[PDB]
Structures are given as C-alpha cells and as structure tokens.
Amino acid sequence: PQITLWKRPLVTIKIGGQLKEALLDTGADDTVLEEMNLPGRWKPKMIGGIGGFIKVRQYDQILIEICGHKAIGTVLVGPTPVNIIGRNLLTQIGCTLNF
Amino acid sequence: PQITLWKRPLVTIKIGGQLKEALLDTGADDTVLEEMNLPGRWKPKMIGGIGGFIKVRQYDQILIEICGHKAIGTVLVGPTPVNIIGRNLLTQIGCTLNF
Numbered sequence: 001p002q003i004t005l006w007k008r009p010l011v012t013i014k015i016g017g018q019l020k021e022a023l024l025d026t027g028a029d030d031t032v033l034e035e036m037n038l039p040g041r042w043k044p045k046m047i048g049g050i051g052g053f054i055k056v057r058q059y060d061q062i063l064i065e066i067c068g069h070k071a072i073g074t075v076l077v078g079p080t081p082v083n084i085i086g087r088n089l090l091t092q093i094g095c096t097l098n099f
Numbered sequence: 100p101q102i103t104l105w106k107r108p109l110v111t112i113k114i115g116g117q118l119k120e121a122l123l124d125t126g127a128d129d130t131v132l133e134e135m136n137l138p139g140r141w142k143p144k145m146i147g148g149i150g151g152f153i154k155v156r157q158y159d160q161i162l163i164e165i166c167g168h169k170a171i172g173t174v175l176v177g178p179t180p181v182n183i184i185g186r187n188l189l190t191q192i193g194c195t196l197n198f
C-alpha cells in the first residue's frame with residue numbers, strides 16, 4: 001500500500017506465531033522489539049539510539065510477516081520504547097520512500 | 100523521487116542558512132537537529148528513544164528546505180547524534196511509504 005504520514009505508520013506484524021503492532025521506522029538500521037519470548041538461539045548485543053545504548057538479545061534469521069509481507073532477518077529484543085521495524089526488514093518487503 | 104532503503108535515507112536540508120545531512124525518518128513524530136545556535140525563543144522539551152531521553156530546545160515556525168521542497172514547522176535542537184526529519188515535515192513535502 002501507499003502509507004501517508006499524518007499518523008504514525010503502525011502496522012500489525014506476526015512473529016513467533018504471535019501478532020503485534022510495530023512502527024515502520026526508516027530511521028532505524030535494525031529491527032528492535034520489546035521484551036518477548038522467541039524460540040531458538042540468541043546472542044547478547046548492544047545497540048545505540050538517540051539516548052544511548054541498551055542491551056539486546058539478537059535473534060538471527062527470524063520469520064516475521066509485516067502487513068502481509070514476509071521477511072526473514074535479524075530481530076533484536078530489548079528495552080526499546082516501541083516495536084520498530086528497521087531497514088533490514090523494510091528492504092525485504094520492498095519498502096521505499098517517495099515524494 | 101523514490102528512495103530505496105538499502106542505505107540510510109540521508110538527504111540535504113537547508114535550515115537557519117546552513118546546509119546539513121538529515122534522515123527522512125518515518126519513526127519520528129518531530130524533527131530533531133544536531134546542536135546549532137538558532138535565534139529566537141524556544142521551549143524546553145524531552146524526547147525518548149533507545150537508550151533513554153535527551154533534552155532539546157523546541158523552536159516553532161522554522162523554515163526548512165528538504166531536497167528543494169520547502170517546509171515550515173517545529174524543529175527540536177539538542178545533542179542528537181544524527182539530524183532527523185520527522186513526520187511533522189515529511190507530510191509537508193508529500194513523503195509516503197510504499198510497498
């Protein structure tokens with residue numbers, strides 16, 4: 001679809017068999033989700049944002065469906081203020097900016 | 100134009116008589132700019148992201164040109180590591196997400 005930006009670009013995602021809401025975030029290199037249980041192995045990592053750095057669990061090669069489009073990539077889980085979908089997955093679903 | 104998201108969507112902006120590089124960021128409600136000594140009145144504000152909050156100065160009715168597209172609105176100035184064009188101005192230049 002074409003998404004205007006008068007409201008937050010919030011969409012429903014499916015990950016680990018569970019539905020969630022997440023923000024399409026072109027300013028994020030990576031995808032960061034709030035604390036949750038995910039199956040498989042993970043590795044501890046750090047990620048930095050506007051206010052500093054947080055510890056996250058890195059899950060690689062995770063199936064995630066975004067607004068009806070499938071992606072398989074890295075998902076970081078940790079104390080992010082909101083679920084954000086970053087460019088690593090936005091590219092997979094064919095997302096572009098247009099003006 | 101159309102901007103793919105393989106790399107950060109950085110564009111040139113003009114504000115306060117200065118040219119800068121900034122992110123077209125659908126994940127930001129507001130526009131956040133690196134420290135710069137703009138004239139005029141302002142109101143303190145705090146915005147939160149990954150890592151916590153930073154203190155910024157809110158300036159209103161600021162003229163800003165983004166890829167030759169003119170806009171005017173609120174800009175937040177503070178110790179951000181990157182210049183961020185948020186939805187308050189992306190809507191004014193006709194920017195959409197498409198997939």
Ligand SMILES: CC[C@H](C)CN(C[C@@H](O)[C@H](Cc1ccccc1)NC(=O)O[C@H]1CO[C@H]2OCC[C@H]21)S(=O)(=O)c1ccc([C@@H](O)CO)cc1
Pocket residue numbers: 023025026027028029030031032047048049050051081082084086124126127128129130131146147148149180181183185
């Ligand atoms: C809460 C949702 C997100 C987190 C909100 N942010 C926008 C988001 O695009 C930031 C921009 C950014 C920040 C610092 C460095 C690089 C890019 N990207 C980001 O953190 O990405 C992470 C994951 O991938 C990596 O790549 C880049 C960093 C890593 S914000 O800047 O903190 C923000 C908070 C409140 C407001 C107010 O106006 C009300 O909205 C405006 C903006």
